[PDB]
Each structure stands twice: as C-alpha cells, then as structure tokens.
Design a protein around this motif. Structure first.
Motif, short mmCIF file in Angstrom:
data_model
loop_
_atom_site.label_atom_id
_atom_site.label_comp_id
_atom_site.label_asym_id
_atom_site.label_seq_id
_atom_site.Cartn_x
_atom_site.Cartn_y
_atom_site.Cartn_z
N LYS A 62 78.60 83.96 18.95
CA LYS A 62 77.62 85.01 19.19
C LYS A 62 77.29 84.98 20.67
O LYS A 62 77.03 86.02 21.28
CB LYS A 62 76.37 84.78 18.35
N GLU A 99 70.78 85.73 12.62
CA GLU A 99 71.10 84.49 13.30
C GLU A 99 71.68 83.53 12.28
O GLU A 99 71.21 83.48 11.15
CB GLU A 99 69.85 83.88 13.97
N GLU A 156 78.04 87.89 23.35
CA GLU A 156 76.94 88.31 24.22
C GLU A 156 77.42 88.37 25.66
O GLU A 156 77.01 89.24 26.43
CB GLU A 156 75.76 87.36 24.09
CL LIG Z 1 69.79 85.80 20.04
#
Ligand SMILES: [Cl-]
Ligand SMILES: [Cl-]
Lengths: 213, 213
Positions: free
Chosen positions: B202, B20, B206
C-alpha cells in the motif's frame, strides 16, 4: 519539503509576473556560489554522485545516507539514513563504512577522468555551516533536477547541455543560466521579474518549475 | 497527459477507498502482460533504453522521439515526437534516421546479456504491428516510473528490486506486484479496492501515485 516549496513559490512568482522580451537581461553579475559542476547517476547499483564548485564529492546512496569527500580528498562527512553525522579520515575508515567510502572514491575518480565541468562559474571558496548536501533529486526524459539543503536549485538539460541554477546569496535570489557553450550568465530574480527574458531561458524556467511541482 | 490522468484516476480511486490491512488479497488472477524487463538510462548521451517482455527494444530519445527495434532485430519502428510512425528494416534504414538507428542498436546490444545457447530465440509475426512504446518516464532516488503508449504503468524500486505494474486487459484494471523475491502476484483493482492489501504494498502504491502527480 519546505525548501522545495519555497523555491517553487519564487520561481513561479518571477515567471508569471515577468514581461515578454527579446533577449536575456543585460544586468548580469560577477559573483561565485556553490553548484554542481559534474554529476554521475548510478542509482541502479549505488546511487547519485555529484561534484561541487569547491571540488567536494558527494554521494546520495539508495539506502538514504549521504557521504561527502571534502576538497582535501582526505576527510569524509557521513550522514546516515536517519541523520547521524560521522566525520573520519578516508584513509583509515571504520569497517562499517569502507564499502561506501570505496564507492565514494569511485564516483570521485569517474568524474575527474571521464566527465567534464559544466560551466565557467568561478570555483568557489567553500564554507557554510552546516555543509551543503543533496536532499533530493529527480530525473525525467528531458532534464536532471537537484535540490540541496540550503535551497540551491539546479536543473541540467541533456541535449543542449544547458543548466539553470537558483541560489540565495545575501538577501537575494539569483538565477544563473548556463548556455550551450558552457558559459555563465547570472541575474537577480528581481531584475528578471521586471525586465523579462529570452525565449529559450523562459522555456527552461518553465520546465524547471514543472520538475519541482 | 490524458494517459497519465487515466491511470491516476483509478489508482487514486482504489487508494482512497481501501481499508487498512495486515495481508494481501487472496483472490488473485494468473495472466501475463507486457512490461519492462530491462531498462538502461543514458540520458546525457543517448536517451532512455528499455526492453519489453515480448523482446522489443525501445529508445525514448531526449528530444521526445521514439524508436523501436522489433524482436527479430530486423525491423525498426520510428514514431516521431508526437506519433508519426515510420517503419523500415535496420539493415536498410533511411539515411535520415541512422544516428538514431545506431543509438537504438547500441541499446539493443547493451540489452544483450552474454549469449548462452538456448531456445527458442524470439521471433516476430507481423513486421508492421504497432507495439507499445514509452511515453514518458521519471526517476527519483527511490524509484523509476514509466508510462506507456497503451496506458501501461510501471514503477521499479532500486534497492528492493520490487515492481508494480498497472495494466488494462479488458476493460478492467489489474495490478501486478513482483516482490523482493521475484514472485509475481496479480490482482484486480476492484479486489484491492474492497479488501485492502499488505502494509508496504500500500506504501508502494502510494509512492507510485505520488510519482504520477
Ligand atoms: Cl494510510
Ligand atoms: Cl560508450
């Protein structure tokens, strides 16, 4: 969501437990429910517009908000990006919503002019509370799929101009097929479960399910 | 579905093994590849039209067949529903394909922005070079996803006008991000695997994967 999974469960339920058949089930019903008669996809600029059986016009905007123009063509229901419903006349609108109201009128009058109704399902008398709105839609190269708050499930096919609608009436699930000649045939899911179905309604039932999953 | 599954394998690969983070990987690559610059959805009447970075105009018809117009606006490639390739000039087109040819020209002329003097006008080398075409596409209220012949994977978002492109130039996987302010940044998937990425790139990766599944 939970709604999507519920419809998909019962659609799959009826599908792999139904016999093989020659024709569509002979047991058909004469009732009216709520469904999308006209639709407009302008998602690259504004959003997705649709007209309901009671002549309600809705817009699912790209920013996430919902806007509905009621059959009286005067009153607007507006749910924002997080869910705050504001109700106000369309004629005199707060200057926050004018842009969105204009687009909503634009969709409403593109449909009536250029577009044609999609089925001979009887126009519906309106009310259920809360009021129906489109929670999500998705489009492939073959079909348009729409799912509403109340679980009514509709898939439009392009070339055939054929449609499938799964609704909840009283305690049953209904599947309505709308054929190449815009004509309505409505079954019970239970009856389709035990009596099987035609070749080309079953292919459309199979595809509608893939769109849900 | 083998193509889709390949992209899904490596994208899920990079996704479930990445840290992350707060920022974008600095180690970047600078190349250009083939991707969709213009797209037009007229699925209820014609099909899905697209223009490529190499100025090829393609149409994925609702029936599953593909038709491609070469950059020279002279040659037509016709790949049948599963891949039977037919090649012929548009000027002299076999009369089996006209209805489809006409539609391809209609898209080709929508693609046409207003004409402005300038150069160089795009020109073709080989009149028979198998150019990539759209295998399938899907649209949600948030994004358009396109998967191509060679496995090139593109997701366009509407409101932001932001894009992600996953390519294979060889035989490594590249992810190109084109942000809210038109700037392209290209990484290697391996680099994105080990170093993480921005918070909402991200989030966009996703979403792209969920669209494939
Ligand atoms: Cl995540
Ligand atoms: Cl037209």
């Amino acid at each position: 969501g939970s709604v999507a999974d519920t419809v998909a469960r019962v659609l799959r339920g009826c599908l792999e437990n139904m016999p093989e058949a020659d024709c569509i089930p002979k047991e058909q019903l004469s009732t009216s429910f709520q469904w999308v008669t006209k639709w407009v996809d302008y998602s690259n600029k504004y959003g997705f517009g649709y007209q309901l059986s009671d002549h309600t016009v809705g817009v699912l905007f790209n920013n996430g908000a919902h806007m509905s123009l009621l059959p009286d063509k005067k009153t607007v229901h507006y749910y924002a990006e997080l869910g705050q419903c504001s109700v106000f006349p369309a004629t005199d609108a707060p200057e926050q919503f004018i842009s969105q109201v204009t687009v909503l009128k634009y969709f409403s009058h593109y449909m009536e002019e250029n577009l044609m109704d999609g089925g001979d399902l009887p126009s519906v008398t309106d009310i259920r509370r809360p009021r129906l709105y489109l929670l999500q839609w998705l489009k492939s190269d073959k079909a348009l799929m729409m799912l509403f708050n109340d679980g009514t499930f509709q898939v439009n096919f392009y070339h055939d101009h054929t449609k499938i609608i799964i609704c909840s009436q009283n305690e049953e699930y209904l599947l309505t097929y709308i054929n190449e000649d815009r004509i309505s045939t409505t079954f019970r899911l239970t009856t389709l479960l035990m009596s099987g179905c035609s070749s080309e309604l079953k292919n459309r039932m199979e595809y509608a399910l893939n769109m849900l999953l």
